């Protein structure tokens, strides 16, 4: 027989090594690999909508930087574009890559 009962490890997640660069006018595979849902081809999820939201976040990030930027500050801001389930996807990702809130104890990867 066998037995597991093991865990408490990273969940398909990993903290950034160095602040990267992102284009608010260009969508590189880098982002598509994390936000492929908007590039799937659904009628609800569109690639044009993913940008609108992103641009906002990427913008706010610097608007507060170097200080940390909470998603709760942009949640209500772009409540019209998409939903919370999406907002988190973009925000988080960008945070995982470093594009936003780089090196900060107030991240979602260090937690």
UniProtKB/Swiss-Prot annotation:
Domain SWIRM intervals: 13-111
Write down the superkingdom of origin.
Eukaryota
Q: List the disulfide bonds.
A: none
The regions listed as transmembrane in this protein's record are none
Listed under subunit, the entry gives: Component of a large chromatin remodeling complex, at least composed of MYSM1, PCAF, RBM10 and KIF11/TRIP5. Binds histones. Interacts with NFIL3; this interaction is critical for their correct recruitment to the ID2 locus during natural killer cell maturation.
Disease implication from the record: Bone marrow failure syndrome 4: A form of bone marrow failure syndrome, a heterogeneous group of life-threatening disorders characterized by hematopoietic defects in association with a range of variable extra-hematopoietic manifestations. BMFS4 is characterized by early-onset anemia, leukopenia, decreased B cells, and developmental aberrations including facial dysmorphism, mild skeletal anomalies, and neurodevelopmental delay. BMFS4 inheritance is autosomal recessive.
Name of the protein this chain belongs to: Deubiquitinase MYSM1
**The species this protein was found in:** Homo sapiens
